[model samples]
Target: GSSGSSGKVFRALYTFEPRTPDELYFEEGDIIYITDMSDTNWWKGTSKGRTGLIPSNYVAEQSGPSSG
Candidate 1:
């Protein structure tokens, strides 16, 4: 999805509870691809072939891919 590169990507600072109802689950070092551009507190993110809402405060803007 080359056309969807406008949104920012982030790395999880710590593990968080799912958004409820079996949403995407992530770990502290998980990679999150922001799927939406809305400024809401909850943002859509895709990780490990799954998508779900991630709390904005759980992550920080990442400049590049992780060294791992």
Candidate 2:
């Protein structure tokens, strides 16, 4: 079953090169669709038609409802 079609979006603040196959490598300013934020250091997201882990600190959440 689908768990709703909502996801937390993030923008890359730095370029990241994956050291393992389970990681997602993204360039600076790339938009990432985050599916999991369970890990404080590493988050799971999808980009460039690929899904993998991303460094949480490497991205910042896009402005949303709580933005002031």
Candidate 3:
């Protein structure tokens, strides 16, 4: 079954890590679709058709519901 969308997106404020097949690298003005979030500083998201883990601090919420 599908996990379904989180219905949230994050805009890159700073490029967190290097790009690889298993990771998504973002630049300024880049937007990524957020999939999962943790209590820590890491988050899972998809961008440019690639899904991977990214630092939560690297980007900020651009659009999404204020409440869960």
RMSD values for the candidates in order, in angstroms, are 3.8, 3.5, 5.3
For candidate 3, give the lDDT of residue 33.
Answer: 80
Model 3 Cα lDDT, one tens digit per residue, 1-68:
98865557789987667655555788777889876776456677887778887777778888556875
Model 2: per-residue lDDT, tens digit, 1-66?
767778988998989888999999999989999979899898999978999999988899887578
lDDT of 2: 0.89
Q: What does candidate 1's lDDT look like per residue over 1-68, in tens digits? A: 35645666789899988849646678899888886848578788787898778888888788664788
Could you tell me the lDDT of residue 7 within candidate 1? Answer: 62
Steric overlap count per candidate:
0, 0, 0
| Runs in model 1 lying further than 4 Å from the true structure | 1-6, 64-68
**TM-score of every candidate:** 0.72, 0.80, 0.66
Scored against the true structure, residue 10 in model 2 reaches a CA lDDT of 93
lDDT of each: 0.79, 0.89, 0.74
Candidate 2's error at 7, in angstroms? 0.2
Give the better candidate number (1 or 3) by TM-score: 1
**Candidate 3: clashing residue pairs, number:** 0
